[PDB]
Design a protein around this ligand. Structure first.
Ligand SMILES: [Mg+2]
Ligand SMILES: [Zn+2]
Ligand SMILES: [Zn+2]
Ligand SMILES: [Zn+2]
Ligand SMILES: [Zn+2]
Lengths: 159, 1176, 10, 69, 45, 56, 48, 56
DNA sequence: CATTTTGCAATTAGTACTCTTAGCTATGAG
RNA sequence: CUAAGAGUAC
DNA sequence: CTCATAAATTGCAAAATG
């Protein structure tokens, strides 16, 4: 790591990278696995190797993350790409001559142990948009109906 | 726009501010003062005196050698070079600041002076006057007299002309502003020291019991002279009920308070009418004459100048002058000690008599209830010594030391007739060590805290430190004159409240100019000379003061003030010069000396074309400034100096600010006279006589208070708390933190610029170097764990990178030469041949004694391995042999801290001995106990952390990053917190940036309407759902983004416990501090509380078993502790008493034993007896 | 006295 | 320092929407709010995550690297 | 021997105990120890 | 510690975090907030001091 | 008092010297003051 | 006043305080580290031999 | 017999944290 | 190790 | 060349007189 970012800074950024988990039930937790530290039945090994061979800034994305362990035919390990450009999350930047070589072991994890494992993002949850159950007392200055915007779900219930 | 000369709006003035900060910068005062010191004041110090003449008389026993010699050494011009460093090998090369910081060097440039050694000879013929002539040996030859430390970015610094690319090349942060020194690799800043101004007459009422009712004083001092303080005081003895009211003056070197009339007749003013005219200016002012009659009736005993001078000489405290020469001696007292600031020559007795009469006139006017006593806290009566004057007076003293040493050496070598050399004469160590000590330690001499370690915890902290002023010690009150010159609310909460101040954003400090051109201007423009000023023939005359020196009177002060203003506005007079016209007192005061604090203001003229008052700045100048800024971001350049040169802006200080009227905003106060109810109420003042205009009211705030969003929507103590708390905020202090080996650094992972941002915070580079994060805050009594300033930080938000930080700590270690060949060596100490090796593991060191970057270090682990040689061939302790010739001097890691070693730096010190700096980096993740605060004084610790599911959530699934208690809002009245949360919500939704400047026309109604347009409740409330059951909360929660700072006060650095550990060597008590595993204080009032609880045994256990229990022996005959005990041999014996069976042992604190021992050592016998010799 | 606790006197 | 991977509050991955955001601001001359809406940031948590980020890393990348290979 | 890097040249050097700390290429007097070869473990959290 | 109520005998409950934790009511005698306040803990070293501390 | 404090004991003739426990050691300030006292005492004794 | 009326004592801790609505009035939350540092000497008695033995 | 008058320093919220600097300078003589 | 100083927390 | 010394409280005894 000859970059400007701290080692654990980049490790933090890497931990927040979403990974494909379609067949995660086929994996095992490393804590209840029989291997010493990590094996193929409980982990996926990636390796990020980058070099600043360009005179301009070279952006180390998550698309350069390459899976090393043989996935045994599963559908795990791959970083999730969403944008049209095809480059993943901007993990780091490199000036000319800077080099960043590192390896990652990826276990299965839930959002309780760390939010980086959270596959949920924001979950909208609403009930009784018209306040017919009287579960809320609407704070108001002159009129609660006017000052409180009608939710989009108000169209799905009888006023 | 289309109209070139159209009036400007309130938004336009910001462009002006931009131009100002393009030329000045945030630390312009530091650099300006140091540039003045180097460019002109060093030469003034050198030239003044420093001409050592030694007149060796012939001492001719015979007329053969009747020749008298005179050896003189003169110092010519002084040459200051670019900073360079010496070396162990002697190679001298250019030194750069990001080499001095790393190598523990001093960014100092050598000084040289041209020494001219002249020698004169004369023929020693008795009676005939000696005539000295040269011997044609006019040898001249620069010599090195020391090194002057150079403040960074100054005109004599390598970074003065560096461009941004050059600064990046030199490992220098472009955001770094300079204006500080590097002493032994540490950044030292000189706090602006506040003092009372010189050459100003101040009159004070005294207490009733004291026989003096009023005291008029001047702290006279001349800048171009010896710079010695003589406090002339004029005191009015006798109370209002007293009938004998004699005014007495306190001349220096005089044992008694001489009556004023005696002084007046001594200076040469004998007749009573002339004295009274010199003191009183109105014949019809019979009240002042009646009060003054006691003085003349007292001095009627003397009717002659020689008589008065003889009277003073008789009272002269020297007591070494004959009767006939006392006159002459008195003359000296009245020529070189009485009011030095006027003149030091003779023939100006009339001028000093005039000044004495003026002082007495001021005293009488204050005593006759015609004027109020002078305010001591008036900021125009105070001067701030910056780096310039401080270094100037320090170097004056230090060079006086050096030249006295030169004279002593010359006298010694001429009396002993040895050879004379310049190198053997000058001792550059004198100046070098004096400057380096006075800058390394806060003590400014041979005051305290003048030089302080530059605060590098945050960029705003660094800026506020570089613009800090300290007042030595009702000075704590925020005075009215502090408006726009120091921050209204930025000062520590503790004992320094009010004494420590911070400059306003646009406030500058004058550097001082030569007042000769102004005197020439006054003389040309009709200033009546003070010598022939007869007040009877010119009663309605306005007195002109220049730097406090009454220089003359003028009969048409209006035209004089107008032309002086024009000359200052056209650049002929330096704009720092301040001119004041007090019409009621009919006085004109011109101040040009350094230390004065002024601020810039727009100029308003009559503007007959529009028929009403208008700013002299119009849209054309704004357009040119915009063009110049855009060109920087081809046309003729237009800078702030151009505005200053064409009379567009002005510099006004607190002295001139007394006689001006300022418009707060142009758009509402200049033009002559259905309104929005949400806008705050403002007044028109129903008056059109403005002289200047505030460039912007938000400029009254300091650097730290310019970060506060909506500070006018907050309680002032909350603004003060935030000002003192943003210096503790955590952010990016410099962009080159990776190449700086500072002692402590804390950096946010993801500093975010505020959603609610001010217009004054893009001159502070806050958006470039933010010191906080935008956290989604909900204000709710959610779980009861956020009560009493506790907070509930979202644990899932922490996990994703909120407020996570890096912490760097550097350990410095040198090898020191104990002797010629006793050099220390960095190495891995080996248990076979090393002594006092620490219990921490050395396994992490390789052969060179340093941990390579990457290796994790834990508590107590050795990171620096150092050993020093000792004398061998000693046997003790069981395992000490001649092989243990190395004693361990290692430096382990902190006991509590741990992390990854970031870097280690090896280099050579000034002596050339290798030394190292080990920087270790760790991660501070927020946890239960860390202190976080808004920009409004809402400090608080993390009560508890909930995951994302447990937090209340809106209908869109958003969960807050923070939950703060509602109860903090009503009591503390931090409405600006709520307003900025609402504004941040609107800004985040709409994508714009919240304009949270203090005094804008931004209303809560407008923000609420914009929020309603975005589909949310206008007042920021959101229907939230309980995270445990999902049921809607019966109350709607205030919700939105808000800017929070993580403060330096973490619980990991404050937890501290001690069951047992190291003790103090003197009192056998636990040591002090958590850095030493010390013990907590069981103070006096804790003992008192335990007494009130009635628990005596617990108190005894606290004071004896827990701290110090010492068993000491005494004898029943004499209660002293002089009992020799041999416990193994079982023999107790008190010598003298001749007893061995009358002994007792007692358990007393070792502190008590030491107290009794110090009592006996001080001839007091605290005899301790174990039985009652008396009944109760 | 002293001062403190001039003289006496003076 | 450099754009965070995920929004702190909700967790939407916004580390891959920074260069697109800058290209929208520069090439398309879109204002901040429209660009944020275009990238899919509908909640003001994500909008404040991307809007107020300060790209300090450029500054860090101006200095010559300490260890250059 | 153990490796160091010039603060200005960024050049790698190997220094023994008796060697005086200078950069052979440029003569700068500030040197920084090289990164350790042993692997370091970071928890990505 | 301006009065005897500002120094009181409590019962230890060991917690897995880095701060002293006290009831909200008992803050009123101590005049203690949670905005960075620090507090001191003294442990008796005998049954007698323990007993009179718990009983007085 | 007859036994504990007579007036003539207010004049010092044999100064007690506290042990190094009172003035632990560079030396302590009391050590230097006692050194100065001994130096002055030796000076006066030799002059006598 | 500095060493007799009030003196530095062992067996004491000091740290930041936080509220806890789930603690009794007479209870105080003690960090696990502070509990691991501050100690009490308990005399070995036939009634507490087992638990102190287990602690050892 | 009755006033009368005068000159000033020591001691004065608790704890608690961090960091920085410095330790008789220069000259004689064995 | 001691002393001095500066800044800071409640 | 290196060691040794240059706010507010208090708490009065004089010195002078008629
Ligand atoms: Mg508090
Ligand atoms: Zn496995
Ligand atoms: Zn005895
Ligand atoms: Zn989000
Ligand atoms: Zn080099």
């Amino acid at each position: 790591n000859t970059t400007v970012l701290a080692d654990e800074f980049i490790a933090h950024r890497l931990g927040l990278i979403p990974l494909q988990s379609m067949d995660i039930e086929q994996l095992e937790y490393s804590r209840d696995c029989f291997c010493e530290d990590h094996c193929d039945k409980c982990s996926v090994v990636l390796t990020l190797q980058a070099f600043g061979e360009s005179e301009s800034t070279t952006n180390v994305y998550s698309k350069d993350l390459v899976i090393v362990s043989n996935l045994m035919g599963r559908n795990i390990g791959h970083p999730i790409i969403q944008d049209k450009e095809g480059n993943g999350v901007l993990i780091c930047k490199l000036r000319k001559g800077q080099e960043l070589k590192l390896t990652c072991v990826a276990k299965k994890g839930i959002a309780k142990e760390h939010a980086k494992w959270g596959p949920a993002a924001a979950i909208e949850f609403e009930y009784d948009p018209w306040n017919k159950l009287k579960h809320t007392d609407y704070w108001y200055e002159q009129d609660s109906a006017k000052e409180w915007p009608q939710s989009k779900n108000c169209e799905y219930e009888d006023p | 726009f289309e109209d070139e000369s159209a009036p400007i709006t309130a938004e336009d003035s910001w462009a002006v501010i931009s131009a100002f900060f393009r030329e000045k910068g945030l630390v312009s005062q530091q650099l300006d003062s140091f540039n003045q010191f180097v460019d002109y004041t060093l030469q003034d110090i050198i030239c003044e005196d420093s001409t050592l003449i030694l007149e060796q008389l012939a001492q001719h026993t015979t007329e053969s050698d009747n020749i008298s010699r005179k050896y003189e050494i003169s110092f010519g011009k002084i040459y200051v070079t670019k900073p360079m460093v010496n070396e162990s090998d002697g190679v001298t090369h250019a030194l750069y600041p990001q080499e001095a910081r790393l190598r523990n060097l001093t960014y100092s440039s050598g000084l040289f002076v041209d020494v001219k050694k002249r020698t004169y000879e004369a023929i020693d013929v008795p009676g005939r006057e000696l005539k000295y002539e040269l011997i044609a040996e006019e040898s001249e030859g620069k010599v090195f007299i020391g090194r002057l430390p150079i403040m960074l970015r100054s005109k004599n610094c390598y970074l003065s002309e560096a461009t941004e690319s050059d600064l990046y090349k030199l490992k220098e942060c472009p955001f770094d502003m300079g204006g500080y020194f590097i002493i032994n690799g540490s950044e030292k800043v000189l706090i602006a020291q506040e003092r009372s101004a010189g050459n100003i007459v101040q009159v004070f009422k005294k207490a009733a019991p004291s026989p003096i009712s009023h005291v008029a004083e001047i702290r006279s001092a001349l800048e171009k002279g010896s710079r010695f303080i003589s406090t002339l005081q004029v005191k009015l003895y006798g109370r209002e009920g007293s009938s004998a009211r004699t005014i007495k003056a306190t001349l220096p070197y005089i044992k008694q308070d001489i009556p004023i009339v005696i002084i007046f007749r001594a200076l040469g003013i004998i007749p009573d009418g002339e004295i009274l005219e010199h003191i009183c200016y109105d014949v019809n002012d019979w009240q002042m004459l009646e009060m003054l009659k006691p003085c003349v009736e007292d001095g009627f005993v003397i009717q002659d100048r020689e008589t008065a001078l003889d009277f003073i000489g008789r009272r002269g405290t020297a007591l070494g002058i004959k009767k006939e020469k006392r006159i002459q001696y008195a003359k000296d007292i009245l020529q070189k000690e009485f009011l030095p600031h006027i003149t030091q020559l003779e023939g100006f007795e009339s001028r000093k008599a005039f000044f004495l009469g003026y002082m007495i006139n001021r005293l009488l006017l204050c005593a006759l209830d015609r004027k109020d006593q002078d305010d001591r806290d008036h900021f125009g009566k105070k001067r701030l010594d910056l780096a310039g004057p401080l270094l100037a007076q320090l170097f004056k003293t230090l060079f006086k030391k050096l030249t006295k040493d030169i004279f002593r050496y010359m006298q010694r070598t001429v009396e002993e007739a040895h050879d004379f050399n310049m190198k053997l004469a000058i001792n550059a160590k004198t100046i070098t060590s004096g400057l380096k000590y006075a800058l390394a330690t806060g003590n400014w001499g041979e005051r305290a805290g003048v030089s302080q370690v530059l605060n590098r915890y945050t960029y705003s902290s660094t800026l506020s430190h570089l613009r800090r002023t300290n007042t030595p010690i009702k000075p704590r009150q925020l005075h009215n004159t502090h408006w726009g010159l120091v921050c209204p609310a930025e000062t520590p909460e503790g004992q320094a409240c009010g004494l420590v101040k911070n400059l306003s954003l646009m406030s500058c400090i004058s550097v001082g100019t030569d007042p000769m051109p102004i005197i020439t201007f006054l003389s040309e423009w009709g200033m009546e000379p003070l010598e022939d000023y007869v007040p009877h023939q010119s009663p309605d005359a306005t007195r002109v003061f220049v730097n406090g020196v009454w220089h003359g009177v003028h009969r048409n002060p209006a035209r004089l003030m107008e032309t002086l203003r024009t000359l200052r506005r056209k650049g002929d007079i330096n704009p720092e010069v301040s001119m004041i016209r007090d019409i009621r007192e009919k006085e004109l005061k011109i101040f040009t000396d350094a230390g004065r604090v002024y601020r810039p203001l727009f100029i308003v003229e009559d503007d007959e074309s529009l028929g009403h008052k208008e700013l002299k700045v119009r849209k054309g100048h704004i357009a040119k400034l915009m063009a110049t800024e855009y060109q920087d971001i081809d046309v003729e350049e237009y800078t702030w100096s151009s505005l200053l040169n064409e009379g567009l802006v002005e510099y006004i200080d607190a002295e001139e600010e007394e006689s001006i009227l300022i418009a707060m905003q142009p758009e509402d106060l200049e033009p002559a006279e259905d309104v929005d109810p949400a806008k705050r109420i403002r007044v028109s003042h129903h008056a059109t006589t403005f002289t200047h205009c505030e460039i912007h009211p938000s400029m009254i705030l300091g650097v730290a208070a310019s970060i506060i969003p909506f500070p006018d929507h907050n309680q002032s103590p909350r603004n003060t708390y935030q000002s003192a708390m943003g210096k503790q905020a955590m952010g990016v202090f410099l962009t080159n933190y990776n190449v700086r080996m500072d002692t402590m650094a804390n950096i946010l992972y993801y500093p975010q610029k505020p959603l609610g941002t001010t217009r004054a915070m893009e001159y502070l580079k806050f958006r470039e170097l933010p010191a906080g994060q935008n956290a989604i805050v909900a204000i709710a009594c959610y779980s009861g764990y956020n009560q009493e300033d506790s907070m509930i930080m979202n644990q899932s938000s922490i996990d994703r990178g909120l407020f996570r930080s890096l912490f760097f700590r550097s350990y410095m270690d040198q090898e020191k030469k104990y002797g010629m060949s006793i050099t220390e060596t960095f190495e891995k100490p080996q248990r076979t041949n090393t002594l006092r090796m620490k219990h921490g593991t050395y396994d992490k060191l390789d052969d060179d004694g340093l941990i390579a970057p990457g290796v994790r270090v834990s508590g107590e682990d050795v990171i620096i391995g150092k050993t020093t040689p000792i004398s061998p061939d000693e046997e003790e302790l069981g395992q000490r042999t001649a092989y243990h010739s190395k004693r361990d001097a290692s430096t382990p890691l902190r006991s509590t801290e741990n992390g990854i070693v970031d870097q280690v730096l090896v280099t050579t010190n000034q002596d050339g001995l290798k030394f190292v700096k080990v920087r270790v980096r760790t991660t501070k993740i927020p946890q239960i106990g860390d202190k976080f605060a808004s920009r409004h004084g809402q400090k608080g610790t993390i009560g508890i952390t909930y995951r994302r599911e447990d937090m209340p959530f809106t209908a869109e699934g958003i969960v807050p990053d923070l939950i703060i208690n509602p109860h903090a809002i009503p009591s503390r009245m931090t409405v600006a917190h709520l307003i900025e949360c609402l504004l941040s919500k609107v800004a985040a939704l709409s994508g714009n940036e919240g304009d949270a400047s203090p005094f804008t026309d931004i209303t809560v109604e407008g923000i609420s309407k914009l929020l309603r347009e975005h589909g949310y409740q206008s007042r920021g409330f959101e229907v939230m759902y309980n995270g445990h059951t999902g049921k809607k909360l019966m109350a709607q929660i205030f919700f939105g983004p808000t800017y929070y700072q993580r403060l330096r006060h973490m619980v990991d650095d404050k937890i501290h416990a001690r069951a047992r550990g190291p003790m103090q060597v003197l009192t056998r008590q636990p040591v002090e501090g958590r850095s030493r595993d010390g013990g907590l204080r069981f103070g006096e009032m804790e003992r008192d509380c335990m007494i009130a609880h009635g628990a005596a045994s617990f108190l005894k256990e606290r004071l004896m078993e827990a701290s110090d229990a010492f068993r000491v022996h005494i004898c029943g005959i004499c209660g002293l502790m002089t009992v020799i005990a041999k416990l193994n041999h079982n023999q107790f014996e008190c010598k003298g008493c001749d007893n061995k069976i009358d002994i007792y042992q007692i358990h007393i604190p070792y502190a008590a034993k030491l107290l009794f021992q110090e009592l006996m050592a001080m001839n007091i016998t605290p005899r301790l007896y174990t039985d009652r010799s008396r009944d109760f | 006295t002293x001062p403190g606790v001039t003289x006496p006197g003076v | 320092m450099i754009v965070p991977v995920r929004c702190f509050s909700c967790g939407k991955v916004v580390g891959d929407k920074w260069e697109s955001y800058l290209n929208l601001l520069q090439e398309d001359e879109l204002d901040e709010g429209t660009a944020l809406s275009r990238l899919g940031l509908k909640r003001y948590c994500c909008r404040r995550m991307i809007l107020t980020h300060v790209d300090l890393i450029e500054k860090f990348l101006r200095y010559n690297p300490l260890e250059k290979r | 021997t153990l490796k160091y890097i010039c603060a200005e040249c960024s050049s790698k050097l190997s220094l023994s105990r008796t060697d005086a700390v200078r950069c052979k290429d440029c003569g700068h007097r500030i040197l920084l120890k090289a990164r350790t070869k042993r692997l370091v473990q970071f928890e990505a959290r | 510690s301006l009065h005897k109520m500002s120094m009181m005998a409590h019962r230890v409950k060991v917690i897995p975090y880095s701060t002293f934790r006290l009831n909200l009511s008992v803050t009123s005698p101590y005049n203690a907030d949670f905005d960075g306040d620090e507090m001191n803990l003294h442990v008796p070293q005998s049954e007698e001091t323990r007993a009179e501390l718990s009983q007085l | 008092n007859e036994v504990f404090s007579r007036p003539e004991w207010m004049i010092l003739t044999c100064l007690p010297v506290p042990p190094p426990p009172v003035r632990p050691s560079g030396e302590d300030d009391l050590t230097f003051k006692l050194a100065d006292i001994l130096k002055a005492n030796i000076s006066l004794e030799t002059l006598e | 006043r500095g060493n007799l009326m009030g003196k530095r004592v062992d067996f004491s801790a000091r740290t930041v305080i936080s509220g806890d609505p789930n603690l009794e009035l007479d209870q105080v939350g003690v960090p696990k580290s502070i509990a691991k540092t501050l100690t009490y000497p308990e005399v070995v008695t036939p009634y507490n031999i087992d638990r102190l033995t287990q602690l050892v």
